[PDB]
Amino acid sequence: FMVSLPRMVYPQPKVLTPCRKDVLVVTPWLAPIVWEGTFNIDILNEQFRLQNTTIGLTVFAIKKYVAFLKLFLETAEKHFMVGHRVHYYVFTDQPAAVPRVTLGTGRQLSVLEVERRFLSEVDYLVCVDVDMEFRDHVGVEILTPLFGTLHPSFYGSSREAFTYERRPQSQAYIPKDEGDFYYMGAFFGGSVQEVQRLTRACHQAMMVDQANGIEAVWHDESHLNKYLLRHKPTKVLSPEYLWDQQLLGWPAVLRKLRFTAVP
Ligand SMILES: CC(=O)N[C@@H]1[C@@H](O)[C@H](O[C@@H]2O[C@H](CO)[C@H](O)[C@H](O)[C@H]2O)[C@@H](CO)O[C@@H]1O
Ligand SMILES: [Cl-]
Ligand SMILES: [Hg+2]
Ligand SMILES: [Hg+2]
Ligand SMILES: [Hg+2]
Ligand SMILES: [Hg+2]
């Protein structure tokens, strides 16, 4: 049951005025492609808050990567799902090395040393790399059953240029005439159920490749792309959500740089 929204005052959407004229804002399977200017965050915040939405954010920090946790968590506190319930899950081999980061109310962090726990604790799972930092708003506009993010190095590339696994012997194989986008494995998510279905499929496909003596060109990312090709994501995030300013600068097509690589 979804309760009614309250009275809200905002600019009337204009049917005869395109949102963005420089980019594709919806996929051929009618999934929104999230760019700045396509959403009214006030309306979305209302919708998700009325549902008491809890977002889980998972990150793996192994070896030297534990050094990136402080900046990652501190910036997440400033830009990630602010106003909503957030549960951070830090998977690490160095529990005592996790920094003591001050969290806002309604946000918690669990350290798992390296399940069904996710199903009873959060509504959505967001899986990202730790050697990153939030620089701008990353909110409920990304929440949906299953989402992938456009890799910043291929959003303007033709499918034949995509670095998909091209060997038929691999379960992640995608021929030159197939493919919608090249998604980056550093930022994906969705409902707990869909994320677990994805990781389960990826894990099984990789086990098969291993038994066949083959390793996908870009490992898990290759399998993620194969999965999202056959199971279309319900939302696709623009490169605003996964950028590298040092390597790619700041193109006009990006009104905001929200989540970036750490120089
Ligand atoms: C323009 C260009 O080709 N730049 C490349 C980056 O794409 C590349 O980033 C890697 O990309 C692969 C997939 O092709 C994986 O996503 C990998 O995780 C990325 O690091 C970098 C690093 O190889 O090299 C150039 O910058
Ligand atoms: Cl991840
Ligand atoms: Hg718009
Ligand atoms: Hg995850
Ligand atoms: Hg995997
Ligand atoms: Hg995967």
DSSP states along 209-252: HHHTT---TTTHHHHHHHHHHHS--SEEE-GGGSB-HHHH---T
Spatial neighbors of 42 by CB under 8 A, at least 6 apart, are 8, 10
Distance of alpha carbon 102 from alpha carbon 169, whole angstroms = 48
Cα distances (Å, whole numbers) of residue 230 to 3, 47, 148, 198, 233: 34, 29, 13, 11, 9
Q: Give the number of the atom of ligand 1 that is nearest the alpha carbon of residue 163.
A: 14
Q: Which two tokens stand for residue 142?
A: 């990304």
Domain 1-263 has CATH 1.10.10.10: no
CA gap 78, 86 in Å, rounded:
12
Is 65 labeled as ligand-binding? yes
Identify the three-state secondary structure at position 131: coil
The alpha carbon of 37 and the centre of ligand 5 are apart by a number of angstroms equal to 34
195 appears as a binding residue in the annotation: no
> Alpha-carbon dihedral of residues 23, 259, 243, 19, nearest 10 degrees?
10
Helix (H) or strand (E) holding 59: strand 54-61
Ligand 1, atom 17, residue with closest C-alpha: 218
Contacts 24+ apart (CB under 8 A), 191-195: 191/123, 191/124, 191/125, 191/145, 191/146, 192/56, 192/118, 192/119, 192/122, 192/123, 192/124, 192/125, 193/119, 193/145, 194/145, 194/146, 195/125, 195/127, 195/146
Which residue among the candidates 141, 165, 194, 221 is catalytic per the annotation? 221
